[PDB]
Amino acid sequence: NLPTAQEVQGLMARFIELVDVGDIEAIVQMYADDATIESPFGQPPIHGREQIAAHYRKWLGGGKLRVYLTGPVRANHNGCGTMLLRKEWVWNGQPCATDVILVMRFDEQGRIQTEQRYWSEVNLCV
Ligand SMILES: */C(C)=C\C(=O)c1ccc2cc(OC)ccc2c1
Numbered sequence: 001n002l003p004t005a006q007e008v009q010g011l012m013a014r015f016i017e018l019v020d021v022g023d024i025e026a027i028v029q030m031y032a033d034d035a036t037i038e039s040p041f042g043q044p045p046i047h048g049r050e051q052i053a054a055h056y057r058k059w060l061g062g063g064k065l066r067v068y069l070t071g072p073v074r075a076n077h078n079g080c081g082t083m084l085l086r087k088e089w090v091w092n093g094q095p096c097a098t099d100v101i102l103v104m105r106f107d108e109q110g111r112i113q114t115e116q117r118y119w120s121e122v123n124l125c126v
Helices: 005-021 024-030 048-061
Strands: 031-037 066-069 080-091 094-106 112-121
Touching: 005 024, 005 066, 005 080, 005 094, 024 031, 024 048, 031 048
Parallel strands: 031 112
Antiparallel strands: 066 080, 080 094, 094 112
């Protein structure tokens, strides 16, 4: 009854494609109304399309954030998918780069219900 692996792959691919061009309005639509993006920093989770919109607006509004799909998009048949990305930007006045594993869980309507992210900071200074 949930989205097949192929659908998940396509959806996450499209998600990356939407992030690449900074289509925030389109991105927010891919999430469920009560979607949740858990924090990888031990903060309380983002919840609702409003907070998600604000989050993506904040982080993508600048345009100075690069995101590259490094690994292939994998997915099971439990409506869950995973992918490996590299994020590159600069906070304050210090260059920053990190590898990120995104895990997305889709609902029966094909929208993102729960999303998790796992970081691995890239060595740059030494
Ligand atoms: C990349 C430069 C940043 C993130 O991917 C990022 C930043 C902040 C949050 C907060 C949160 O819950 C408050 C969930 C995910 C992220 C992701």
